Design a protein around this ligand. Structure first.
Ligand code: K1S
Ligand code: K1S
Ligand code: CL
Ligand code: MG
Ligand code: MG
Ligand code: MG
Ligand code: MG
Lengths: 194, 194
């Protein structure tokens, strides 16, 4: 019933553009929307985010997260490890690569979502969410080496899965960080389960 | 270590703008970023709210109430938590209850309210509060709930059992051309993972 009629370029950066979208509303009236898109998509999706489940025996399972300065936010954010998918890279491969560059951990794929949207009232940005387990008892994950690309500066924060929401709420109040909505949603469901 | 040096407007729409952000990297070098921001954010603690609406009924499994709408930035239909922008002077809780009623017809009760969390922090400054609300589906006010859509609002309600949420979303994606929201998918993954 609703569909895109045309798209007008408003402004095009190196990394992001703004478009004016005309679409048919379901009454048969034509309407406009301001839409953001990345300039980098090729790919199943723009990016991957990794849910990295760090498993060490005799320890709580942790979720591995990352803290970095985010210029659009003007501050530091706590997020799942994540990055854009390289041209001709598979989402699974982007996930293991990003996880290793951002955390130093070497992981195994558990499951991979379909392309899911990031903020669909504003942008067309999508990701695959890739669940990965990390055998923290293996030697390759003993002293994990974060291999930042150029211009990336990432701290690693591992939090216990079974107290995640309370741990996140603490970091916000105590450290004035911004938690990522996907991270927060995950944490909420861990509490809301049963 | 890192901080914003300057924000230059590149292009300003009615609803969205694009900025060139200059910031200080942690080596002491000056760098730039392309930042998306809304034009609608004033004194709110965030741009918007998303509502996690837990529908509770005697002798029924708990359901998560979701909405399906056409999203011009995506060029198609998306399945999302009920959500909207916070009106000027409105509290996040009130915004949540209001958007839930407008989009679904249901009258909820506040459970919890998150701090402001970021939507896509490598791209935009956009933030929401995630508001968990319970809906007493035995109350007569919630027996036969009618969405009150605004001008240009056309929303379908999809209530899915919490205990099978991820499979039920997968089955929707398999049988139709739609995209699931990444916060919804994140929430459904954690429900499985717990
Ligand atoms: C805040 C949601 N609204 C208002 C209905 C928006 C958002 C954007 C990004 N573009 C738009 N073009 C027309 N309305 N509109
Ligand atoms: C894809 C992540 N990067 C590349 C490091 C980006 C993204 C945006 C939005 N602006 C940017 N300005 C400079 N680098 N940059
Ligand atoms: Cl898992
Ligand atoms: Mg990254
Ligand atoms: Mg990278
Ligand atoms: Mg809405
Ligand atoms: Mg609304």
């Amino acid at each position: 019933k609703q569909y895109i009629i045309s798209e007008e370029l408003i402004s095009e950066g190196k990394w992001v553009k703004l478009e004016k979208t005309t679409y048919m509303d379901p009454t048969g009236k034509t309407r406009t929307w301001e839409s953001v898109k990345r300039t980098t998509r090729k790919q199943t999706a723009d990016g991957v985010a990794v849910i990295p489940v760090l498993q060490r025996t005799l320890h709580y399972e942790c979720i591995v997260l990352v803290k970095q300065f985010r210029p659009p936010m003007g501050g530091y954010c706590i997020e799942f490890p994540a990055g854009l998918i390289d041209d001709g890279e598979t989402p699974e491969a982007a996930a293991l690569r990003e996880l290793e560059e951002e955390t130093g951990y070497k992981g195994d794929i558990a499951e991979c979502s379909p392309a899911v949207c990031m903020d669909p009232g504003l942008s067309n940005c999508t990701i695959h969410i890739v669940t990965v387990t990390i055998n923290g008892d293996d030697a390759e994950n003993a002293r994990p080496k974060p291999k930042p690309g150029d211009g990336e500066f990432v701290e690693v924060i591992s939090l216990p899965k079974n107290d995640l929401l309370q741990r996140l709420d603490a970091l916000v109040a105590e450290e004035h960080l911004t938690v990522d909505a996907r991270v927060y949603s995950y944490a909420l469901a861990l509490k809301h389960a049963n």
